[PDB]
Every structure is written in C-alpha cells, then in structure tokens.
C-alpha cells in the first residue's frame, strides 16, 4: 500500500502546479484521482 | 476557518463514495407493509462530480453491509432484525449512454 | 464485516450535519454564463432521518466556508477565486408546516 | 466539554436497553441524539 500510494501521490504533486495552463490535461488528472480513492477505500 | 485550496477541493468533490444517508423503502420497494426504524441507513455510495458533461459517477464495484433494523408492522408488532444494504467500494466516471 | 448494532444505525441515519456533495450552480442561479470546476463542493448539510411522518430534518445554525474555486467564462478565459458556501452546524426535527 | 459530553453519554446508555418496550419514549432519544450530535460539533 505505501509504495503504491506514494506512487501516485508523486504523480499528482507534478500535475498540481499546472491546472491555470490553458491545455492542462484534465482527464489525466481525473483517472488518477480515481486511482487516489480507489487505493485509500483498497487500503 | 480556513480557505479550502482548490486541488483539496477538487480532489473532495470528485466522483468517490461518500457517506449516503438511504431510505429503506428505496431499497426494499416489496415492503410496503412495514414502517423501518430507522427509516434510512448510512451507506457508502458513489457521489460527486465528473467535470465533464459526457460522463456519469458510476459504481465500479459493490459490496454488502449489515445492519440491525427494527421492522414495524401496524396492528401486529415490531422486532429488530438484520438487514443488508448495497454499498459501492469504487466509483469511476464513464460515458452516458 | 461485522454487523452495524441498532443504537449505532439509529444515531448514525437521525438528522444531523453530514459531508453532502452539493452543485455551485444550485447555490449561485444568477450566474448561468460561467462554467465551475470542480462543479461540486463538499457541504456540512442537513441529512438523515426524524422517525415520524409529521417532523422534517432542519437547520437551526448556520456558518460560512469558502473554497477555492476555477470559474470559465467561455469564450473569454478562466481564473481561480474564493467563493464562500453555506454550511450547517445544527439540526433539527421539526414540525411540517 | 468532557463534562457534558460524559453527561449526555450517560443519558443515552439508561435509555438504549429499552427500545424494544411497547411504549419506549422515541422523542426523548431523539432528542438526547440531536443534543449529542450539536455538542460533538461545537466540541
């Protein structure tokens, strides 16, 4: 579980800062908050 | 009080279960000769919020609960007894049909 | 999976504040040119159950939270700002009028 | 806090072996709970 929770909490620390540029990704953003809740609710 | 950062938002409000408060006969629409106390139950169930207009909050995979219940039935009696609710352990948004 | 006990069930569904996933647009009608992400906020809201037909869970306190909030105008830009939300601290069961 | 918390706790364990009686006071319980309820809250 901290392994992969550490994981993904990497990924949405690099996402964060950029959500104001005007081409963010937001579905890359959304799967991966799916993926945050999903392993809490797992673990 | 502090302000609420917005990705603390934005993660809160997405598509997740939250914690539902769920009327019985919603559940259990075949007993309608029954009063239920309590009458709705605490059920984790998907909620939130897509950010998209072509998708849904949708259950991905469900599991069971039990709960004592006390079911009423007028002009007889009452007695308390175990009764299983639905609950959703993860949500994804997809696409409306 | 053990089984939730009655008294538990019973505090846990009666009217009280719960985390309640609520749409700005609800909350701010006169602003139908934006687009709000995320268009959802988590809410301490009244919720649950009063166990008699003649009562209805109601807030009888109130306060105040503010988030951070993306607001688009389309075909213009976008900006993140604080918006405030009514939250409720107390509640109720009360008489339908 | 503690005090009124231990008081209302206290008041909730005298009622919650009687809900099966035919004539148990439900408007009492409810509201002793609505009073729990808003002191964990305020607490």
């Known amino acids: 579980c901290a392994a992969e929770l550490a994981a993904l909490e990497a990924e949405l620390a690099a996402l964060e800062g950029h959500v104001e540029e005007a081409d963010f990704p937001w579905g890359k953003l959304n799967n991966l908050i799916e993926k945050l809740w999903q392993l809490k609710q797992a673990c | 009080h502090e302000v609420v950062k917005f990705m603390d938002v934005y993660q809160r409000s997405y598509c997740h279960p939250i914690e539902t408060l769920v009327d019985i006969f919603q559940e259990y ?58 609950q959703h352990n993860k949500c994804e948004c997809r696409p409306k049909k």
Do not use: A, W
Not at chain 2, 29 to 37: Q, R, S, V
């Open chain 2, 29 to 86: 629409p075949d007993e309608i000769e029954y009063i239920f106390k309590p009458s709705c139950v605490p059920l984790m169930r998907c909620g939130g919020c897509c950010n998209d207009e072509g998708l849904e909050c949708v259950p991905t995979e469900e599991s069971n609960i039990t709960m004592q219940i006390m079911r009423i039935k007028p002009h007889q009696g009452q007695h308390i007894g175990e009764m299983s609710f639905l």
